[PDB]
Paper text:
Recently, a newly identified type I-F variant, known as the [name]-[name] system, was discovered to lack the Cas3 helicase-nuclease gene in its CRISPR loci. Instead, an [name] nuclease domain is naturally fused with one of the Cascade backbone components, [name], generating double-strand breaks in target DNA molecules. The RNP complex displays an overall G-shaped architecture, comprising single copies of Cas5, Cas6, and [name]-[name] subunits, six copies of Cas7 molecules, and a crRNA molecule. To elucidate the molecular mechanisms of target DNA cleavage by the type I-F [name]-[name] system, we reconstituted the Cascade complex and obtained multiple cryo-EM structures representing the target-free, partial R-loop, full R-loop and [name]-bound states.
Furthermore, we also determined the cryo-EM structure of the [name]-[name] Cascade-crRNA-[name] complex at a resolution of 2.9 Å with a 56-nt targeting [name]. The whole 32-nt protospacer sequence of [name] was clearly traced. The complex in the [name]-bound state closely resembles that in the full R-loop state, with the exception of the hook region of the [name], which undergoes an outward rotation upon PAM binding. When aligned with the target-free state at the Cas6 end (crRNA 3′-end), the Cascade complex in the partial R-loop state exhibits a maximum displacement of ~7 Å, while the complexes in the full R-loop and [name]-bound states undergo displacements of ~22 Å. In the partial R-loop state, the [name] nuclease domain undergoes mostly minor movements compared to that in the target-free state, whereas the [name] nuclease moves away from the Cas6 subunit by approximately 11 Å in the full R-loop and [name]-bound states, thereby disrupting the [name]-Cas6 interaction interface. As a result, the helix from Cas6 responsible for contacting the [name] domain is not visible in the full R-loop and [name] states owing to flexibility. Since the target DNA mismatches in the protospacer sequence are not tolerated by the type I-F [name]-[name] system, we analyzed the structures to understand the mechanism behind this high fidelity. As aforementioned, the [name] domain swings away from Cas6 and is thought to adopt a catalytically competent conformation in the full R-loop and [name]-bound states.
Author numbering:
A (entry chain B): 12 to 233, 236 to 332
B (entry chain E): 0 to 254
C (entry chain F): 26 to 97, 102 to 107, 111 to 116, 125 to 338
D (entry chain A): 11 to 335
Write the structure that this text describes.
DNA sequence: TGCTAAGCGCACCTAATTTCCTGACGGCAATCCGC
């Protein structure tokens, strides 16, 4: 096998639904829910952007009218409720395009070898650790008295999670609930179970009339703050929940210096720490050209990274 | 023998043609009259002699296959090209040519002159409009094939009539400039493909679809038309597109 | 180049390769007859085709299609800078004309009625017209659509020059008026609601009729809930057949309509409903009057 | 004698599928409730994670990649997807719209009637009904589904429905009574014993509550916008007829190397699936050679090759000779 | 099983003015050529 196929692509194996926001009261959290809506907020400002010295003289005491939007809780509610659900799909049944059949056979052989060693269990334990620590609450985890994340698969509600008792730079491998959910995600990733739909509900006690931060939408041409409305109510993008669920990579070359996980991307880009962490031989392209194109038994940490990107997906196609 | 009017009500055409060299929109009128003559030739082969000599073209809904951009223009889609006969027929990616496609709901009022024009002929058309295509598009469903008497049983819809006097009496220059000026003056007027003018003489060339019928190379000729409601249409007979031939001109006209 | 390539470049108003670029041979036409100016139609002899089309076969002899495209245009050859090639001295005006000599499966061939017989018409598209339309609709505001379909390789493969300059042409938009355009509302107004309760399991139904009196709250509630805000005008309502009321009783015998009972479309046929065996329960005339008055006040 | 193919041989489709429309429903009220499914616009902020030259990588590895997209997802309270499409089965002899030579028309009509005599379009029809009853027309909507239910309604008779997760996508069943009942009518429609057949298919896919629905993507070439432009039919999501038809023509299991690659491919001329990038039938078992050995150098080809030639003629297309100048 | 018939629903004057309306980075890879 010389060179990757001309049309090689992979589909997701962790399909996350879009998130809807609700308001509750924490002592009535199991019997009461209200819609949370986005409110337009025009704001008047001062001209505080940095200007060149021949523009600051004319526009330093000039009013700055700006349009914007916001989401805030009611005066009778102390808790934000976010509801999303995740569809777990198998990894071998996710190659959407592969122009060569030998390359398909080689990918299936190496995934079967990984199922023989570790049945997608460390990766799944890291995913349930990013469901249990509530990393999907990006700016909604700052300033919270109690965060409770409940996970429901099929019709069983698993015991709830004290999300604030989980460090975001460590991964627990001794929690019974995380292991029991992660074994089901592991068997779904392996192939034993054909699909797994996992529904997540998280209660964030932030306070009364406090601000809830949704996902801001992208504007392209020449704009203001447009926040995400899912079915009228406020909400977050599925992309943002998945980038907080793929923050599992502690296998990059410079981990002992920067001791925290990063999201799993092809070239190892991290927007928090603005440095590329996998720009060369430890990138997916040079770890899939040395696992299948020139057969080499890679270290297990690198294998974790390759299967994590094969759960993420993408167009990995040569010219 | 027995003149009459059959209405083929609300025919839903899916993925018809829409490209006629300079037009992306309503198909050619020769295509709808070809649906008429194909219906005629298939009925006359079940031993039902019915000469169709005039077609009404009513319009209820449309969807050009594509999307409308933010600047209010149109982007036309195409299906992914498959194996196209030629030198490059074994390559997995084929060339993309100029093509546009439309979805229409239309009602066709036909001028039918046969020995007997009854409701059995309507049943014959129902059993004949499910093996034919309008332009090059499939018929998903039709409401009803019925006989009409006057301009009151006709459903609501906007017909297409030929407006050539709004094109001959136009600004100046050449016929393209007259067309562009006329479309600037009346914004409820559309360009329409109306037939063909020969570029050669009648003869036998090699490569014909039928080697025994005469053949002539043609360009498409185009004109103007507009939309009139069913209520405000006077004495019908002005929505009835009919074939008309001359020496070198293959034209579809509303007389 | 420009004095030894003028003998294999042909002159056309019409190329066959602009419908499909796999049409064998050098097929096309050069129509130069006359403008009628009052005929009612736009032909290539009735619009102002200012610049002709030079169609090639091989990429080597593409020098006339380059010289004629350098702005000063050498199209000035109806000023006279000379001698920088001698054969080229206005030999771009007695070029061989593209003559139609055959047909193929890729040229669009259709039949046309001529006097009880038929004439096969193989349609050749016009390059120069399309070029003139694209020039005279950039400087205009009539409805227009750009066809971004032909790549430069296939436009080069067409052999034409006014397709290599204009590969993505601007053409007229002949669409029906905008109120006749498809949307969700003009389609969710052709679909009819059906009720969420099966009459054959309704728990209190006496083989078609409404035995229990407390089911009329349920029937009224479902008739409101399904279809409260889906009122339909007369043309958008479903037709009221008699085969449906017959097929309803057919379900339980009851040949004559039972005296004192009227077929009730559970969801109303004005506020959205289907003329179907599902959307009918043979309720008593008293309770039918109650339900058709309850839905009257909504 | 016949020494070539006609100078204009054309064939029309005999399995004319219609565009699809997507609906959202519940499952315990799937026969009564039906809600519209709309296609939203989702804009994304990404990273430049595509392969680029090693010089461009140093300049662009940490650069934002904003992209435009569209997406169809279900509601928070409806867990199923309803796709309803229709087919128009037509005769094979009455789908030849053009043929220049009369003797080729006579010979091809003799070969179609000989196919009506021995296995009269029945095995092909059973394969087409299997490609309705395993729900291969759910291209990426068949993954992650709890219950798939497919209902076929010829004329006005509603046939017993299918559990489309109990059919393998690589094995064609020839024993189910409903499939045989539908397939005999499709075979009689292909023979010419019936002039037309209208089949309406309605599917119910229980994927989950707010999960992603995958319509067909439109090829729209715009220079200003380059994003995922999905298909909207009458305001709501759907699928092209070509996608569903390419699903239904995946019946070819008679290619020269089926024992190695053991999966059905779509019935094309040179055996050109869009998944595997090698032509599967490129010289000796291609349609052009296997119809010039059937009609021109008369010869009784094996029944698998006759199945392939008849399946091409049900697919239809421009099937003439190498056009000359 | 009915719930009325008839006429008509103003004439004037106007609808403010100032200062301004952000800074950033970026917007994919593949493939669509006959001869």
């Amino acid at each position: 096998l010389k060179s990757r196929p001309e049309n090689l692509s992979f589909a997701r194996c962790l399909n996350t639904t879009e998130a809807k926001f609700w308001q509750t009261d924490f002592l009535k959290r199991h019997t009461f829910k209200l819609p949370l809506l986005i409110t337009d907020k025009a704001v008047l400002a001062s001209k505080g952007h940095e200007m060149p010295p021949d523009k600051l003289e004319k526009e330093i005491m000039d009013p700055n009218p700006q349009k914007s939007q916001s989401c805030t809780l009611s005066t009778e509610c102390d808790t934000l409720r976010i509801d999303f659900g995740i569809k777990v799909l198998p990894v071998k049944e996710s190659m959407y395009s592969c122009s060569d059949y030998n390359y398909r056979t080689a990918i299936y052989q190496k995934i079967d070898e990984y199922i023989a060693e570790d049945g997608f269990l460390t990766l799944a334990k890291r995913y349930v650790n990013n469901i249990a620590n509530a990393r999907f609450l990006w700016r909604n985890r700052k300033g919270a008295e109690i965060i409770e994340t409940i996970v429901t698969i099929e019709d069983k509600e698993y015991p709830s999670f004290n999300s604030k008792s989980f460090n975001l730079d460590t991964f627990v491998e001794d929690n019974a609930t995380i292991n029991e959910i992660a074994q089901q995600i592991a068997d779904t990733f392996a192939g034993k179970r054909e699909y797994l739909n996992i529904y997540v509900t998280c209660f964030v006690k932030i306070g009364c009339a406090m601000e809830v931060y949704p996902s801001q939408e992208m504007t392209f041409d020449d704009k203001g703050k447009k926040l995400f409305k899912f079915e009228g109510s406020a909400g977050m993008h599925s992309q943002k929940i998945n980038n907080a669920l793929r923050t599992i990579d502690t296998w990059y070359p410079d981990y002992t210096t920067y001791e925290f996980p990063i999201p799993v991307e092809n070239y190892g880009a991290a927007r928090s720490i603005g440095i590329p962490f996998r720009p060369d031989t430890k990138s997916f392209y040079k770890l899939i050209d040395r696992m299948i194109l020139k057969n080499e038994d890679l270290p297990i940490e690198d294998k974790h990274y390759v299967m994590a990107i094969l759960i993420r997906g993408g167009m990995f196609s040569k010219k | 023998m027995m003149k009459g009017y059959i209405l083929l009500e609300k025919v839903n055409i899916e993925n018809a043609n829409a490209f006629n060299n300079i037009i992306v929109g309503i198909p050619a009128i020769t295509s709808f009259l070809g649906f008429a003559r194909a219906l005629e030739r298939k009925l006359n082969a079940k031993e039902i002699a019915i000469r169709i000599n005039g077609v009404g073209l009513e319009f209820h809904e449309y969807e050009l296959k594509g999307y409308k951009n933010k600047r209010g223009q149109y982007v036309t889609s195409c299906p992914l090209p498959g194996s196209i006969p030629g030198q490059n027929e074994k390559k997995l990616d084929a060339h993309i040519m100029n093509q546009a496609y439309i979805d229409l709901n239309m009602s066709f009022l036909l001028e039918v002159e046969g020995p007997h024009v009854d409701m059995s002929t309507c049943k014959s058309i129902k059993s004949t409009m499910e093996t034919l295509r309008i332009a090059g598009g499939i018929i998903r469903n039709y409401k009803k094939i019925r006989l009409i008497d006057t301009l009151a049983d006709i459903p609501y819809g906007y017909f297409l009539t030929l407006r050539q006097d709004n094109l001959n009496d136009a600004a100046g220059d050449d016929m393209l400039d007259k067309m562009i000026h006329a479309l600037q003056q009346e914004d409820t007027l559309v360009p329409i493909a109306v037939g063909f003018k020969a570029l050669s003489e009648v003869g036998h060339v090699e490569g014909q679809r039928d080697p025994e019928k005469d053949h002539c190379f043609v360009e498409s000729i185009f004109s103007l038309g507009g939309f009139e409601c069913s209520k405000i249409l006077e004495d019908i007979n002005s929505c009835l597109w009919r074939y008309k031939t001359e020496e070198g001109l293959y034209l579809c006209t509303i007389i | 180049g420009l004095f030894q390539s003028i003998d294999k470049n042909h002159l056309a108003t019409h190329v066959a390769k602009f419908t499909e670029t796999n049409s064998p041979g050098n097929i096309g036409a050069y129509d130069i007859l006359s403008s009628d100016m009052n005929c009612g139609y736009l032909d290539t002899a009735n619009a102002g085709w200012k610049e002709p089309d030079i169609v090639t076969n091989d990429a080597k002899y593409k020098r006339p299609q380059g010289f004629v495209a350098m702005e000063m245009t050498v199209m000035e050859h109806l000023s006279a800078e000379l001698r920088h090639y001698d054969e080229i001295r206005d030999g771009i005006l007695n070029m061989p004309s593209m003559q139609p000599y055959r047909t193929n499966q890729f040229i669009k061939q259709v039949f046309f009625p001529v006097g009880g017989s038929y004439h096969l018409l193989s349609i050749l598209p016009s390059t120069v017209l399309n070029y003139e339309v694209s020039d005279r609709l950039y400087r205009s505001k009539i409805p227009k659509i750009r066809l971004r379909l032909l790549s430069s390789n296939a436009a080069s493969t067409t052999g034409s020059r006014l397709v290599s300059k204009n590969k993505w042409p601007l053409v007229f938009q002949a669409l029906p008026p905008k109120f006749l355009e498809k949307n969700l509302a003009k389609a969710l107004d052709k679909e009819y609601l059906l009720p969420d309760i099966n009459i054959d399991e309704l728990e209190g139904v006496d083989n078609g009729c409404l035995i229990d009196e407390a089911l009329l709250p349920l029937i009224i509630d479902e008739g409101k809930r399904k279809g409260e805000g889906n009122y339909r005008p007369r043309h958008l309502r479903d037709e009221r057949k008699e085969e449906t009321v017959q097929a309803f009783l057919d379900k339980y015998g009851y040949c004559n309509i039972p005296v004192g009972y009227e077929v009730h479309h559970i969801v109303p046929l004005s506020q959205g409903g289907a003329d179907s065996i599902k959307n009918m329960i043979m309720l008593s005339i008293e309770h039918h009057e109650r339900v058709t008055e309850a839905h009257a006040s909504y």
